[PDB]
Amino acid sequence: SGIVKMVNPTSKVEPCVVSVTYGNMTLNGLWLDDKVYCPRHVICSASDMTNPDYTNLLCRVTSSDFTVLFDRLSLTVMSYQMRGCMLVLTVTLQNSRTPKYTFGVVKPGETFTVLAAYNGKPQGAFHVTMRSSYTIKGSFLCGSCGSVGYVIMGDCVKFVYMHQLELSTGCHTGTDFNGDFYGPYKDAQVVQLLIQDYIQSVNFVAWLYAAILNNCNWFVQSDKCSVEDFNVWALSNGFSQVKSDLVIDALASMTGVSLETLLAAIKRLKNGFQGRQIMGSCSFEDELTPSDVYQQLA
């Protein structure tokens, strides 16, 4: 028993973390095969950050201007390409430790592991949940840009995130591996307003199912609320739209408690828990998906 935010093992991703330097700027990159992916703002100086003209900045850049390090091993950049807000450098050396990998794009509510890196050196890992605002609540200092988020799917590493910006205190965003930012955010040093965030309802439902299997069911009552009725209520109560899933169905079968029973429970919990905790919390713990809790339940 017990429910915690678990990170995926890091062994497959650690040998891909590199340092990328251009001018006075050093950030992190991801070395897969003979390609090095990194944020494109590595090529802009402090004077060119409010509204950088990246295409004009790329004219003054040569492959020799990049210093790519895998610890002390210097990689030779043959060529480079700008793909959205990301640079894809081609190096002479294939990473012999490149794992089986794919690129993916996470949706709000989905979780992944961030391998925090500084100066191309992994420091540790942490669990993040993509918010409805297309931001994550991570821990990143200047120099952690280029740290990657990933999820292990089977024996494959699915890379989903490359850290780029801090939109406000403890509020971070980055791009997918197509170079597209999550949300409408841009790599510009300007104040950027956040997309509307919501309590990830299906993640809180997962928390409630996990609580039932962790000797906590006081919130379960005879009232039921359909998905349709919950989704209308959710619009005006800061909760995201709910959709049933095969994992929710498995959780309903393991506990004998229907989704509708928990949707009615959420509406009651919205006006207060009355000092009672659900697994040590009086908050809408929406950081773990149904799949995350399912892996910690029996």
Name the residues that contact ligand A1AUY, by CB under 6 A.
Answer: 41, 49, 142, 145, 165-166, 187-189
Comparing CB distances to ligand A1AUY, the nearer of 4 and 142 is: 142
**Measured distance CA(18)–CA(79) in Å, rounded:** 17
Residue 153 CB neighbours (<10 A): 12
Choosing from 38, 85, 145, 225, the catalytic residue is 145
Structure tokens at 225: 């609320």
Edge-first strand order for the sheet with 17-22 is: 73-75, 66-70, 17-22, 25-32, 35-39, 86-91, 77-83
CB 165 within 8 A of CB 187: yes
Comparing CB distances to ligand A1AUY, the nearer of 89 and 145 is: 145
Structure tokens at 81: 């390409």
**Is 145 an active-site residue?**
yes
**Computed from CA positions of residues 57, 59, 65, 69, in that sequence, does the dihedral angle turn out positive or negative?**
positive
The CB-of-200 to ligand A1AUY minimum distance in angstroms stands at: 25
Residue number with the shortest CB distance to ligand A1AUY?
Answer: 142
**Measured distance CA(243)–CA(125) in Å, rounded:** 30
The CB-of-152 to ligand A1AUY minimum distance in angstroms stands at: 28
Comparing CB distances to ligand A1AUY, the nearer of 89 and 264 is: 89
**Is 163 an active-site residue?**
no
Comparing CB distances to ligand A1AUY, the nearer of 49 and 235 is: 49
**Is 146 an active-site residue?**
no
Choosing from 84, 143, 171, 216, the catalytic residue is 143
The CB-of-46 to ligand A1AUY minimum distance in angstroms stands at: 8
Q: Which residues are marked as active site?
A: 41, 143, 145
